[PDB]
Design an enzyme around this catalytic site. Structure first.
Site, PDB file in Angstrom:
ATOM      1  N   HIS A 135       0.768  -1.258  -0.165  1.00 52.06           N
ATOM      2  CA  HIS A 135      -0.053  -0.166   0.088  1.00 52.06           C
ATOM      3  C   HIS A 135       0.907   1.364  -0.079  1.00 52.06           C
ATOM      4  CE1 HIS A 135      -3.887  -1.566  -0.072  1.00 52.06           C
ATOM      5  NE2 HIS A 135      -3.882  -1.858   1.266  1.00 52.06           N
TER       6      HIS A 135
HETATM    7 ZN   LIG Z   1      -5.471  -5.924   2.545  1.00 53.33          ZN
END
Ligand SMILES: [Zn+2]
Ligand SMILES: [Zn+2]
Ligand SMILES: [Zn+2]
Ligand SMILES: [Zn+2]
Ligand SMILES: [Zn+2]
Lengths: 368, 316, 506, 182
Positions: A135
């Site tokens: 992320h």
């Molecule tokens: Zn995830």
């Protein structure tokens, strides 16, 4: 096949913890390692303690200022870091704990060492469950992830592999990895994620890439409660088409446990076998492959799934009974190596999924 | 020996007492071990790179870190300051507002006019019209720019958001009632599939989700047009049966005229009605934002003429 | 074929507001503002459901980058930031112009989280407490091992120990003790060992209580549709629901006589439904004994006449058409719902039978330390007692009233892995079916239509006049506003076809 | 008092408001046409046609006063909260080279247009005499009309994502966070 299987694990990875109510607990890796250990699989792996990454190694992707702030941030001096915290999104979503830099260095070193072992030919199969942080993107902490070790591993693999395949099975889209490789044509990112009013917010069917990366990004928007059969029926043809029309020299698999049933934040209806099926099917192709453990918030389910996937990579099938690990009480009612899918409805429909596969295949038509 | 160690835990206990007997009554009814890894963890270092005063700002009127004045209860943001002050580079001294410093230093009620006329005669040589404003701006605090309440109101489809942001008309188990009109009781028929596909309670799997487009109220199936989920937090969903209102001609950009209040909205009808080189600002039946009346029957001739021209130019 | 094309388009769109937008799009193209691609896309979205107008349109006009929605493009001045490790190859393959920043892709509105039951929340709380205890104990034990190694080396991983010492020493003295250690180790080691002993005792007791808390809650969390099945069935088992379903099916069919199609692949489920119905009828204190006998006899007679199963085998365990009103249709719908639920339970019976019989138990710690027979003491473990027949017995118990719904649902969850949650309301559905039969016989119009059905069915050999005469005779008793149903039955294959004639017979 | 801003200029102003406050875009500074070339072109194009010494000299006085006022007030009340970050960045870079900031040399044609939108509101808070209020309003209207004929060379329709020469530039996630977080 009985591929040589490397395995990286630091014993200290379980000594770092997030906030009290935080859904990230690296201790999941610890009962995963305990499950793999007590199953008599250590006779089937070569177990490595990868050297933690250095500042210059993670500066290959992240900015030097971000790394410097990461290496000096501490819950005791955070009030000296106000502009950096908001600039790099290191606030409430991704907090600061005692061993943040140590954990990030350990994960990055593990991923880098696995990629290096694949490059050198020391193995065809390496496992690192301390990674999966997909992320964060080069300047910020997102989705509880601070360092995109997957990007560094892909960079190391590309040194010796012309083309590399990245596959994401987490309900969250692989925003960081796709962004890192949204223009290049040497990296395929393919994320099977739940799309909607969901945290990633991105990963739509029309994000195939820009520039030379056009038609080089694959996104799989999925509805809630997808089960093992539907997930397999969507996963296998797309993966086969990618293998046929792109032919990567290596593949990287993020084995996120969010898709598992009973997940704290997940919404899918994937069980034990339905989650190990994709891993086994991908391993059945024969190219050098990576395993990184990303999502997953129920440590018992994700640890059992990780142990079973480790067994599957060694061409063996583990038994349902448990070997009486240290953390036995976590497994509750029957202490079986399985994950029970629930009875909630599945919203995914054959027409919508058929449209998705048609669009994906049309996009992939210009990849060979 | 420290007795303050036992403070609190997630169990609501000092982590040393026990199952908290009330919790007991609430929650009751009535292949070797891991110590071999350290001798087998082969440290791998074969890396290729191994060798390397209020709660709102007085300028932006929002919430955040503030640098308030001791004499003026007017909290200011750091970027909302003229000039902006870096928090690391703190002034470390008596700080006052521009109005605060003006009222605390040059506060000469009798001789303010003397300074006004001094500045006026100083600027009289070059700029006499702007002398008063050039003097007065030094008497005011830094502020965030805002439209003066009449540029906004000439366009009825424009409204101001919470923090002054711009807002428009696009701001916004088994459920069988979603297929009902809920006003007339008639089933909602999707435009594409021409069906409601209600399904059944016994077999909810046969039901197909419907949206009832926000703008034209045309119901659409979530499977007919590809869409993963509904629209509940974002902007009002628009059906694919609306005008683009913005075209990137191959680059060049086209935009549809913004809506204006009807008092200033002028109308005109062409007397030709054969061919008009006019924009997409048409009406189906200060001279810069006029709304032409397209005379729909004329469109039938115009489109046909254009396609015929495209047919004969490509013919040769 | 072009002005007529315009008329056909106007008729097919069927809305002035949508035709106005279509004309606006056509003009926008006509003023050399729209290209061919977008124009054909809009025509496909408008009339593309048609295959004759759109195909001619594509073949008459001579029709013959893709930027992502969540990716912005940053200026080049906002790109070059020194990355020390980024080599030339690392510079070429990375993308820096485009960023997603999901805040932009969320329209600054946020995200919607999943809905979880309170059982899941309790499981999460137990998880959190377990993780706290285990993390603290493991970190303290690692520091203990390190201090033991140091002590063994003193006879003659840079922050874990510091964190453990700071946690243990809370009087702000921990910094001083750490500094003294860096330059006094055995005292720290023994304090850590004592803390470890206390923490392990607390962890053992808490593991106990966590375990019996988890035992009573784990199966209920996975019962997503089963927790709310009672109210959902109560709401969605009304006559209006079925009428709406059948009318929507009829409308979809007419937007292009077999609206509903039921198949009956078994004949022994009817006996189980009869047993449950008679058990309820005997148990209920709402009908008199003559009324109870009338219920039972009418049910048996109706089923024997309809399905042609038997007349004595039921008591010891050609195409026919039924013209029925709302009441008979809803009664038949209740019967079909019960039959379908029981058939769903019965078809898969063998697999749960094997799984319950072949239910292995781990001997490492289960049979050695913690034995859980809470559902086995009360005897609904499905040990032996074939799951279909045991389920029938449990339903009879629940109807009788000696078995609670909580334990019934828990046993159903444990024996079927939350795959038999539709049986939670079986008693209520049987009660509704019995009430429907009572209403069917207690009304003169329904009784007369039922007698007409008896006559027509017992005739069993009639010409084509029978359908018209039957329909007219039903209509004579039947109103001009309510709806009729043509329940076609094929006894040869036990398949029931249902057609919806609202008022199409007038 | 009564400023008759053209409808197109009001639309441009509201479009800028939308682009900054909603689309999180900032002006591509320094502007290709900042305040000085546009004002000097206006003065050169209009004053060359005037023959009255008073009318021609007062045009120069008005242009000079507009430049002075713009320079004075850009950092005070002509910038949104988002553009305060760009203002601080420009100030830091200018102080690095010891050059005083001259905003008329950076901002242009869109911040001057927003400068002349609260002029009726700005004059109201003075003791400015009515006989010159009309003169100021008339000069502003004449300048607005001159701009109104020449609009295709100061507010073009260009996509930042398709051309780096567009008048607006996308703000980074880091930039947006720093700008609107403290
Ligand atoms: Zn995830
Ligand atoms: Zn402010
Ligand atoms: Zn002040
Ligand atoms: Zn539809
Ligand atoms: Zn619409």
């Amino acid at each position: 096949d009985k591929r040589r299987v490397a395995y990286f694990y630091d014993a200290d990875v379980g000594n770092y913890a997030y906030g009290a109510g935080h859904p990230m607990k690296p201790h999941r890796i610890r009962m995963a390692h305990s499950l793999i250990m007590n199953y008599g699989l250590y006779k089937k792996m070569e177990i490595y303690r990868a050297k933690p990454a250095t500042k210059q190694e993670m500066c290959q992707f992240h900015t030097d200022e971000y790394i410097d702030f990461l290496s000096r941030v501490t819950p005791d001096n955070l009030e000296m870091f106000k502009r950096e915290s908001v600039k790099f999104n290191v606030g409430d979503d991704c907090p600061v704990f005692d061993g943040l830099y140590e954990y990030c260095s350990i994960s990055g070193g593990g991923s880098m060492e696995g990629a290096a072992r694949l490059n050198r030919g020391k193995c065809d199969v390496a496992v690192n469950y301390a990674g999966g942080l997909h992320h964060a993107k080069k300047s910020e902490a997102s989705g509880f992830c601070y360092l995109n070790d997957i990007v560094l591993g892909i960079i190391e693999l590309l040194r010796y592999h012309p083309r590399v395949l990245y596959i994401d099975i987490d309900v969250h889209h692989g925003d960081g990895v796709e962004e890192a490789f949204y223009t290049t044509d040497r990296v395929m990112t393919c994320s099977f994620h739940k799309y909607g009013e969901f945290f990633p917010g991105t990963g739509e069917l029309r994000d195939i890439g820009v520039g030379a990366g056009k038609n080089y990004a694959v996104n799989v928007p999925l509805r809630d409660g997808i089960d093992d059969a539907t997930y397999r029926s969507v996963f296998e043809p797309v993966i086969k088409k990618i293998m046929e029309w792109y032919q990567p020299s290596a593949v990287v698999l993020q084995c996120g446990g969010d898709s598992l049933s009973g997940d704290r934040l997940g919404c899918f209806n994937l069980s034990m076998e339905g989650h190990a099926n994709c891993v086994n099917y991908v391993k059945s192709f024969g190219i050098p492959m990576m395993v990184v453990g990303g999502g997953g918030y129920t440590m018992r389910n994700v640890a059992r799934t990780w142990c079973f996937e480790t067994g599957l990579l060694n061409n063996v099938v583990l038994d349902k009974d448990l070997p009486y690990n240290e953390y036995y009480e976590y497994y509750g009612p029957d202490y079986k190596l399985s994950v029970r899918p629930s009875n909630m409805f599945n919203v995914n429909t054959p027409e919508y999924l058929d449209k998705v596969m048609t669009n994906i295949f049309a996009n992939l038509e210009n990849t060979k | 020996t420290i007795s303050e160690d036992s403070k609190v835990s997630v169990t609501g206990l000092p982590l040393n007492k026990g199952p908290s007997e009330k919790i007991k009554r609430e929650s009751l009814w009535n292949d070797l071990k891991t110590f071999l890894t350290e001798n087998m963890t082969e440290e791998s270092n074969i890396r290729s790179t191994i060798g390397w005063n209020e709660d709102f700002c007085s300028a932006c009127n929002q919430s955040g870190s503030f640098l308030c004045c001791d004499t003026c209860p007017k909290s200011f943001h750091f970027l909302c300051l003229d000039p902006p002050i870096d928090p690391n580079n703190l002034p470390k001294g008596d700080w006052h507002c521009n109005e605060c410093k003006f009222k605390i230093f040059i506060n000469n009620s009798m001789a303010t006019l003397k300074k006004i006329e001094s500045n006026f005669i100083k600027q009289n040589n070059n700029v006499k019209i702007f002398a008063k404003l050039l003097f007065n701006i030094d008497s005011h605090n830094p502020k965030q720019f805002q439209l003066p309440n009449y540029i906004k109101e000439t366009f009825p489809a424009v409204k101001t958001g919470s923090r002054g942001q711009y807002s428009d008309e696009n701001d916004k188990s088994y459920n069988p009632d979603t297929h009902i009109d809920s006003n007339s009781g008639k089933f909602l028929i999707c435009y594409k599939c021409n069906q409601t596909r209600l399904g059944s309670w016994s077999h909810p799997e046969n039901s197909r989700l419907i949206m009832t487009c926000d703008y034209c109220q045309t119901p659409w199936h979530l499977d007919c047009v590809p869409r993963a989920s509904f629209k509940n937090l974002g902007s009002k969903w628009k059906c694919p049966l609306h005008s683009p209102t913005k075209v990137y001609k191959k680059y060049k950009v086209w935009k549809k005229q913004r809506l204006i209040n009807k008092k200033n909205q002028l109308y005109y009808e062409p007397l030709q009605k054969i061919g008009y080189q006019n924009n997409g600002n048409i009406q189906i039946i200060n001279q810069d934002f006029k709304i032409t009346q397209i005379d729909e029957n004329s469109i039938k001739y115009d489109f046909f003429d254009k396609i015929y021209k495209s047919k004969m130019v490509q013919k040769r | 074929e072009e002005v007529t094309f315009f008329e056909k388009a106007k008729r097919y769109i069927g809305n002035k507001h949508l035709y106005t937008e279509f004309l606006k799009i056509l003009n926008l193209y006509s003023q050399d503002i729209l290209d061919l691609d977008d124009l054909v896309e809009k025509v496909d979205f408008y009339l593309g459901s048609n295959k004759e107008l759109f195909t001619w349109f594509k073949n008459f006009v001579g029709y013959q980058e893709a930027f992502g929605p969540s990716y912005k493009r940053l200026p080049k001045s906002d790109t070059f930031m020194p990355c020390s490790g980024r080599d030339d190859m690392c510079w070429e393959v990375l993308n820096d112009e485009w960023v997603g920043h999901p805040v932009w892709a969320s329209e600054d509105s946020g995200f919607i989280a999943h809905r979880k039951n309170q059982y899941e929340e309790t499981l999460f709380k137990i998880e959190e407490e377990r993780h706290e205890y285990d993390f603290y104990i493991e970190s303290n034990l690692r520091t203990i091992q390190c201090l033991e190694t140091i002590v063994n080396k003193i006879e003659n991983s840079m922050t874990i120990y510091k964190k453990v010492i700071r946690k243990v020493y809370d009087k702000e003295r921990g910094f001083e003790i750490i500094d003294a250690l860096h330059e006094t180790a055995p005292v720290v080691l023994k304090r850590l060992k004592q803390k470890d002993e206390e923490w392990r005792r607390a962890q053992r007791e808490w593991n106990k209580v966590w375990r019996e808390l988890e035992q009573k809650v784990f199966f209920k969390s996975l019962d997503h549709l089963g927790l709310t099945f009672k109210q959902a069935d109560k709401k969605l088992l009304t006559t209006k629901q079925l009428i709406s379903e059948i009318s929507s099916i009829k409308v979809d069919q007419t937007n292009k006589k077999s609206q509903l199609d039921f198949d009956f692949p078994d004949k022994n489920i009817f006996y189980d439904i009869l047993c449950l119905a008679d058990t309820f009828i005997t148990h209920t204190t709402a009908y008199s004994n003559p009324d109870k006998e009338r219920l039972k006899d009418l049910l048996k007679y109706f089923i024997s006449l309809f399905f042609s199963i038997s007349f004595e085998k039921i008591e010891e365990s050609s195409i026919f058409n039924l013209f029925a009103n709302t009441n008979i249709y809803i009664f038949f719908r209740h019967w079909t719902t019960i039959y379908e639920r029981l058939l769903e339970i019965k078809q898969m019976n063998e697999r749960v039978t094997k799984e319950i019989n072949t239910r292995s138990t781990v001997t490492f710690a289960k049979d050695l330390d913690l034995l859980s027979s809470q559902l086995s003491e009360m005897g609904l473990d499905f040990v032996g007692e074939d799951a279909y027949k045991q389920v029938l017995r449990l339903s009879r118990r629940l109807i009788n009233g000696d078995l609670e719904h909580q334990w019934f649902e828990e046993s159903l969850r444990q024996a079927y892995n939350n795959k038999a949650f539709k049986l939670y309301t079986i008693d209520k559905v049987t009660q509704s079916l019995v009430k429907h039969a009572h209403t069917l016989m207690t009304d003169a119009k329904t009784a007369e239509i039922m007698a007409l059905f008896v006559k027509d069915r017992n005739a069993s050999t009639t010409s084509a006049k029978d359908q018209i005469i039957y329909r007219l005779q039903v209509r004579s008793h039947m109103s001009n506003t309510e709806n009729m149903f043509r329940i076609e039955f094929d006894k040869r294959t036990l398949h029931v076809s249902i057609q919806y004639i609202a008022l199409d017979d007038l | 008092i009564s400023l008759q801003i053209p409808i197109k200029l009001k639309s441009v102003l509201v479009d800028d408001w939308e682009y900054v406050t909603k689309d999180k875009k900032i002006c591509r500074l320094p502007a290709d046409v900042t305040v000085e070339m546009v004002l000097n072109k206006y003065e050169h194009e209009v004053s060359q046609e005037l023959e009255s010494p008073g009318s021609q000299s007062q045009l120069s006085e008005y242009c000079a006063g507009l430049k002075l006022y713009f320079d004075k007030c850009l950092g005070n009340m002509l910038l949104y909260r988002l553009e305060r970050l760009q203002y601080d960045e420009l100030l830091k870079k200018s102080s690095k080279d010891q050059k005083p900031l001259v905003p008329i040399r950076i901002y242009g044609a869109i911040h001057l247009l927003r400068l002349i939108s609260v002029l009726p509101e700005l004059i109201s808070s003075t003791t400015m005499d009515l006989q010159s209020c009309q003169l100021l309003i008339k000069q502003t209207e004449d300048f607005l009309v001159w701009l109104l004929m020449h609009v295709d060379e100061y507010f073009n329709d260009k996509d930042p994502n398709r051309s780096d020469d567009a008048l607006y530039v996308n703000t980074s996630s880091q930039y947006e966070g720093v700008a609107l977080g403290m």
